[PDB]
């Protein structure tokens, strides 16, 4: 009986492929020399990238807003390596190999976010977060208000992380799109 008018809107993060596909009349793009975080997802609290990575926001701000910070190796590929040997390893290694592995072993800037987030196992995140929530639930309430509210904020964080990862595994989008490699132009 009803005329069953069906229409729907979808908003979503855009792939870099779509950024290349841009090319009220026209659109353009900038080839970014380095990956760049989306300020809505790094900075504007609660930090969504931090909610995925389970890193304090001060650490992700360190990795690109501070003048010095370093990532641990990226999870999905072999690594061995972990004064500061900054010059020494480019002596113990040829640069033709060094520039190939170094960013795998240690990295800085939003490229570290991009690569760690693309390596992210969104499902073991669900398993680990459920396990930790269960642990914090079977652990008895403390008598200290600061510790208690810390525990409660941790449970809330784990729930947010479960929600975000569940959506990222149940939507045709990818979390590494939270870091741009191409910027659109009006």
């Amino acid at each position: 009986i009803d005329r069953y008018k069906h229409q729907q809107l979808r908003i979503g993060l855009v792939s870099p492929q779509q950024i290349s596909a841009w090319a009220r009349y026209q659109m353009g793009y900038i080839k970014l020399t380095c990956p760049v975080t989306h300020v809505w997802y790094l900075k504007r609290l609660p930090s969504y990238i931090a909610n995925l990575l389970d890193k304090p926001l001060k650490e992700l701000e360190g990795l690109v807003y501070c003048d010095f910070s370093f990532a641990r190796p990226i999870t999905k590929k072999p690594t061995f390596l972990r004064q500061s040997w900054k010059y020494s390893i480019p002596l113990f290694f040829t640069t033709q190999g060094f520039e190939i592995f170094r960013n795998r072993e240690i990295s800085t800037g939003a490229g570290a976010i991009r690569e760690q987030l693309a390596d992210l196992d969104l499902r073991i995140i669900i398993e680990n977060s459920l396990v930790e929530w269960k642990q914090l639930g079977e652990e008895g309430p403390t008598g200290n208000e600061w510790e208690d509210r810390k525990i409660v904020r941790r449970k809330d964080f784990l729930v947010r992380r479960m929600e975000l990862a569940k959506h990222f595994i149940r939507t045709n989008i990818e979390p590494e799109w939270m870091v741009l490699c191409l910027l659109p132009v009006l």
Partner: protein, 279 residues
Amino acid sequence: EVAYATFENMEYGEDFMKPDTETYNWVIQAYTRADSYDRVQDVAELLGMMVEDYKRVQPNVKTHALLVECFTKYCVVKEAIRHFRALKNFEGGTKVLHNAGNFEDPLSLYLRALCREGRIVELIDALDAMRRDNQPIPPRAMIMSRKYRTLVSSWIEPLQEEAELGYEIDYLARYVERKRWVPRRGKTPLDPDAAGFIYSNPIETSFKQRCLEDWKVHHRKLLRTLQSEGLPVLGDASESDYMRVMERLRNIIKEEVDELICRIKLHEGDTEFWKRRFL
């Protein structure tokens, strides 16, 4: 959404167009086989509406089969077991839940869920239900890890360590079988072939771990009742005994007192108690 629009057309229409059992089946099928989003809350809503229609709608074989499909494609096994335990009473119910082995395989997904969640005392009942139907085991249920274990043993306490076979493993022969295990860069597909689920298969838990968890949960519920009803739930006891038995409960969650624990009842089941507490 396009099916639920018709369902919403029917459920709020004239009596001659109210949903029947099949209408609920078709809309639950629409949700449970949706391509792109989580539909569990919708399926549970629809189930609750079907129960609210109890004066008019009663379930059928396909209803329970679709609900077991939902509650096993999503890891909701504590409700899947209950709907399968209802499906048991219909002949060919397991044939329907096998669904000719397409749209993945809800029966295989259910058997895997029971395996990895260690619910073996339910798994043998599912197997007996299949036996009554003469339903064979789907090959999709006999999936193995790179350590060859099936649902016959993958829940026995060493969950992923193989037993001694009396000889070294013929790795060079088993290599002839491509199912490489390299973990790829992040994308929707899965590495373990058992994970035909929507989100993921249940976390691997032994029959020991599942039994211990159920024991803990039961005693935690007993403690919750004890601390809500108070000493009158024992009655002919001391408050000293009440304190001691609370400490015993808290300990076993983390002699006469065990007989006191035997005397405290639970009423999770029949509402006839709650439908009297309400008065």
